[PDB]
């Protein structure tokens, strides 16, 4: 990645063994749960397109996902070419651009952050994969007969996180969470009314 | 390897324990899966020919692969000697010293003997991954009760080691094959996998 130093200058560094291994292990352990994306983003802080390609290439297995990711990159690269040395879509993806040229654009004044633009495409691809690999739909999350409300709410927002529109997710939350609760808790939550906080709702259905 | 410092100058540093160990462990754990090559390239970032030789010599076992690698280096070194009457043996680190290697790499204009030698090594490793690939792409077919996701993983994993439009759909099982052909050509993998989910 490109980072600052003692002198206060944006200089290239080699990607560290810690970062390489961290990314390999999170994918090995968590596969493509929602939380893998913010970890990818953090581990790729200040990354060049080359570093992003390095991180993706080090992933063994999950090649269905990595292929879907390639297709997303192509669409975004095509889109970039349509809307637009001056960087093309392939230059951002790191196929037709050197490390010298990538550092050039990223440390330019004004800078063209090709690393961040390429990360935006990858994250957008990873979100689709999290959507795909999400086993359950939000509509199928319903509180069991003797399931604690806390466990039900955990499942609801875990599922909702993987499903990902803001206008929909809010409408889903407001009505769907209470509606898919069990009879006993549902009566209490409706009695408590609209605009009640989750803390109040969980406290009310505790006993 | 050769890296920058606080003053902003290209200087030699000793290859770290972390890097040495990381390369030993990945070869121990993953042998020669496709992903071992990009890890080698990353762990040998800014490496001198000496450092590359150090990383290869630290590998215990897999001497069949290491021997195949040597023969690839020879072919590429001979080709360099033909095209350049720094020799091929100097890029490999056999006839060159660390000081000479650092000289070429930090020269203006530079001659990156580390990158040229890495290119030869990666070219040799790709052949070894080809060799050690267990299954052919033709043999990968979806099982009776195998999910489509697991099938596609096995397809592209195999395709990666060997190295799509017709072979992927045609080797799927009956239930999925009918749905995929019903969707038609030019469909994305996402659309294909969404179709063969339930």
């Amino acid at each position: 990645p490109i980072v600052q130093n003692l002198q206060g200058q944006m200089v290239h560094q080699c990607i560290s063994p810690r970062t390489l291994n961290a990314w390999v292990k999170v994918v090995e352990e968590k596969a493509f749960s929602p939380e893998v994306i913010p970890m990818f983003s953090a581990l790729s802080c200040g990354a060049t397109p080359q570093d992003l390609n390095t991180m993706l290439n080090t992933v063994g297995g999950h090649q269905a996902a990595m292929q879907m990711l390639k297709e997303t990159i192509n669409e975004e690269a095509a889109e970039w070419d349509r809307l637009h040395r001056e960087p093309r879509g392939s230059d951002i993806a790191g196929t037709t651009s050197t490390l010298q040229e990538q550092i050039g654009w990223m440390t330019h004044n004004p800078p063209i952050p090709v690393g961040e633009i390429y990360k935006r495409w990858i994250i957008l691809g990873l979100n689709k994969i999290v959507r795909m690999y999400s086993p359950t739909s939000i509509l199928d999350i319903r509180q069991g007969p003797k399931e604690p409300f806390r466990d039900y709410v955990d499942r609801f927002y875990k599922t909702l996180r993987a499903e990902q529109s803001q206008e929909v997710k809010n409408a889903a939350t407001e009505t769907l969470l209470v509606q898919n609760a069990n009879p006993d808790c549902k009566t209490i939550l409706k009695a408590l009314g609209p605009g009640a906080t989750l803390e109040e709702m969980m406290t009310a259905c505790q006993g | 390897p050769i890296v920058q410092n606080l003053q902003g100058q290209m200087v030699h540093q000793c290859i770290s324990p972390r890097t040495l160990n990381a390369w030993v462990k990945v070869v121990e754990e993953k042998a020669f899966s496709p992903e071992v090559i990009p890890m080698f390239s990353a762990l040998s970032c800014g490496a001198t020919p000496q450092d590359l030789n150090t990383m290869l010599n630290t590998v215990g076992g897999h001497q069949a692969a290491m021997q195949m690698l040597k023969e690839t280096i020879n072919e590429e070194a001979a080709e360099w000697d033909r095209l350049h009457p720094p020799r091929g043996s100097d890029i490999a680190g056999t006839t060159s010293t660390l000081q000479e290697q650092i000289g070429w790499m930090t020269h203006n204009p530079p001659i990156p003997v580390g990158e040229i030698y890495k290119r030869w090594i990666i070219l040799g490793l790709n052949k070894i991954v080809r060799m050690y690939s267990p299954t052919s792409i033709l043999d990968i077919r979806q099982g009776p009760k195998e999910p489509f996701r697991d099938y596609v993983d096995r397809f592209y994993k195999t395709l990666r080691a060997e190295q799509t439009e017709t072979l992927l759909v045609q080797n799927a099982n009956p239930d999925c094959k009918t749905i995929l052909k019903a969707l038609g050509p030019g469909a994305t993998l996402e659309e294909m996998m969404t179709a063969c989910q339930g």
Binding site: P49, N53, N57, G89, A93, T95 | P38, R160, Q163, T164
Partner: peptide, 14 residues
Amino acid sequence: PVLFPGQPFGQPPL
């Protein structure tokens, strides 16, 4: 396209 099926990320074409 920029990336083809099978080839790694950051792979130059041709």
